[PDB]
């Protein structure tokens, strides 16, 4: 079946460069291969004949010029795109309303920094808003005791308009593994909503407090290990509470999850999955080191409804404990049109049934995509934390879980990457624990790229570049060394040693991915878009099933980079139009 996807505008962007004005725009999932384009500067056509490629350099444009693009569909020109003004800097700043610092019940002062983001179109005009999580400077890993400041979630238009702020309140602890926020048009009306775990004292964007306003379930460890827990869907445009239910997976006893001090119980993940093959569902998970639960919901016709539960503590589900990562993937792995869940070393079917477990246990990085385009199906590359695991890195059939190849490490392998960086080996290369491999498991040369964090499509070629901290690098495959391509001076990455951008996504312009980094003082987000010309046109990545879902889960726990459902890389085949409709 055709999948619900977003009605997007042209995503037209124009950026001042020394060579003139660089202009790029979207090839929309609704458009055929036969569609061409005309480029207009202030109502004047620039190109003598319609162009195919979705980027263009206007040598004679100026900082005051405005641009439109018109599609040419089966010979006739279509109405103009939305108008685009010229970016006077290589990035676009979104000014932020930095939350005031505070002081914990124990007298610890904290301040706020801009942290993980997501995107959704909350008003339905085809341009994304940014949904930003603020992090207090005393946020905590689950292993660490201590009180934390409130978690704040804001919505911003790209012009800097602050639409709202939600304060999750004292009963939601701050830290990577706590709030996992989903931004998506769940009900299919054309407008995104925001869904996340909430509690008594959560304040919506209109200033209305949920539940028992004054209840305080913080224990002396600064953890919230008792009291009600809620799941709320908020209106994207206003941050208003739409509906709130009791949260599942429910806590039960803290000790059910594998410790009594409050670590394992509060290990959350979340996602958007097309469980019915047509429309989105919401996935909320709890646990992964031992007891593990996953619960699916719909938000449709104004109602939240629970669809299924997978609980490893149920007789027959024992194998589905102890396998999850600090991240997950979502993809149709078995070809039935419906999305499955890649939950670290295990997988869960669209109906909530456990599919397989590799038994290799918990890890910190995960990549699900078409890694080996010579092998039908998707593949999963994963690293493993247990020093005694049979493999420190595993490369597997996404659908069956069969190990295609793996390498024993005998130690915690905390990072792993997948990206087509070497055109001499068909498909995506993978690297971890000091070695680079082909998709077939053949070690390539010696050493690895200088980062093992994100892959990003940045330059004009079909290979994928690397992102880490405030840097984009490109692998010189002939010489076996990384070389810097961009250092975003004045921009900072997030999450300490994880060094993740606020967001990486194809948010605007052509198929290359934008990066959103905070400034060092979090007074702004900067949106960088490439001005490197390309000869290639590809469907906007937000119209790919798997990529779009990757953007939805990018924020969760230990942020991972997004992948396409198809092999995008050197030697790739031309892609057909995505099977989609818009609301
Ligand atoms: Ca919008
Ligand atoms: Ca909606
Ligand atoms: Ca499927
Ligand atoms: Ca299935
Ligand atoms: Ca870990
Ligand atoms: Ca494959
Ligand atoms: Ca390759
Ligand atoms: Ca490239
Ligand atoms: Ca782009
Ligand atoms: Ca995160």
Swiss-Prot record:
Binding site for substrate: 115, 135, 415, 495-497, 558
Cofactor(s) of this protein: Ca(2+); Mn(2+)
Co-factor remark: Binds 10 calcium ions. The calcium may have a structural role. Requires calcium or manganese for activity.
Keyword match Disulfide bond: no
Temperature-activity profile: Optimum temperature is 60 degrees Celsius.
Family of this protein: Belongs to the polysaccharide lyase 11 family.
Protein's job: Pectinolytic enzyme that degrades type I rhamnogalacturonan from plant cell walls and releases oligosaccharide products. Degrades rhamnogalacturonan, polygalacturonic acid, pectic acid and pectin.
The protein's assembly and partners: Monomer.
Protein name, entry field: Rhamnogalacturonan endolyase YesW
Gene: yesW
């Amino acid at each position: 079946a055709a999948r619900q996807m977003e009605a997007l505008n042209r995503g037209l962007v124009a950026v001042k460069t020394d060579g003139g004005i660089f202009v790029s725009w979207r090839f929309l999932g609704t458009e055929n291969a036969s569609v061409l384009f005309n480029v207009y500067r202030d109502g004047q056509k620039l190109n003598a004949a319609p162009v195919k490629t979705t980027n263009y350099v206007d040598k004679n444009g100026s900082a005051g010029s405005t641009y439109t693009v018109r599609a040419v569909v089966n010979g006739t020109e279509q109405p103009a795109s939305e108008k685009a003004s010229v970016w006077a800097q290589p990035y676009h700043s979104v000014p932020l309303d930095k939350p005031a610092g505070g002081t914990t019940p124990k007298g610890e002062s904290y301040t706020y920094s801009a942290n993980d983001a997501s995107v959704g179109d909350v008003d339905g005009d085809g341009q994304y808003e940014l949904i930003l999580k603020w992090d207090p400077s005393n946020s905590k890993d689950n292993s660490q005791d201590g009180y934390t400041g409130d978690v704040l979630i804001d919505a911003y238009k790209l012009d800097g308009t602050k639409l709202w702020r939600i304060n999750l309140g004292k009963n939601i602890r701050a830290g990577a593994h706590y709030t996992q926020f989903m931004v998506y048009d769940l009900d299919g009306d054309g407008k995104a909503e925001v869904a996340m775990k909430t509690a008594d004292g959560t304040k919506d964007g209109t200033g209305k407090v949920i539940g028992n306003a004054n209840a305080d379930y913080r224990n002396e460890q600064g953890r919230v290990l008792s009291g009600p827990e809620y799941l709320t869907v908020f209106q994207g445009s206003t941050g208003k509470e739409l509906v709130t239910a009791n949260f599942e997976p429910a806590r039960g006893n803290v000790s059910d999850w594998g410790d009594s001090y409050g670590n394992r119980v509060d290990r959350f993940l979340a996602g958007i999955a097309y469980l019915d093959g047509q429309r989105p569902s919401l996935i909320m998970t709890r646990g992964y080191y031992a007891k593990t639960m996953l619960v699916a919901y719909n938000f449709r016709d104004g109602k939240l409804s629970k669809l299924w539960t997978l609980d490893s503590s149920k007789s027959g589900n024992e194998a589905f404990a102890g396998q999850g990562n600090h991240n997950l993937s979502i993809a149709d792995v078995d070809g039935d049109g419906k999305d499955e869940i890649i939950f670290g070393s295990m997988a869960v079917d669209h109906d909530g049934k456990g599919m397989y477990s590799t038994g290799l246990g918990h890890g910190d990085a995960l990549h699900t995509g078409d890694l080996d385009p010579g092998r039908p199906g998707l593949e999963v590359f994963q690293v493993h934390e247990d020093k005694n695991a049979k493999y420190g890195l595993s490369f597997r059939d996404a659908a069956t879980g069969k190990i295609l190849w793996g390498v024993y490490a005998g130690k915690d392998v905390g990072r792993g990457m997948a990206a087509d960086i070497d055109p001499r080996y068909p498909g995506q290369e993978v690297w971890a624990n000091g070695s680079l491999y082909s998709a077939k498991g053949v070690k390539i040369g010696s050493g690895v790229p200088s980062s093992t964090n994100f892959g990003i499509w940045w330059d004009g070629d079909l290979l994928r570049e690397q992102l880490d901290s405030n840097r984009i690098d490109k692998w010189d495959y002939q010489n076996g060394v990384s070389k810097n391509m961009l250092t975003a001076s004045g921009a900072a990455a997030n999450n300490g040693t994880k060094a993740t951008p606020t967001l990486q996504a194809d948010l605007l312009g052509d198929w290359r991915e934008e990066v959103v980094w905070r400034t060092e003082d979090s007074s702004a987000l900067r949106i960088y878009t490439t001005t490197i010309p390309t000869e290639h046109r590809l469907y906007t990545l937000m119209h790919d099933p798997v990529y779009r879902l990757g953007i939805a889960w990018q924020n969760i726990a230990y942020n991972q980079p997004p992948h396409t459902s198809f092999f995008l890389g050197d030697g790739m085949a031309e892609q057909p139009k995505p099977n989609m409709y818009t609301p």
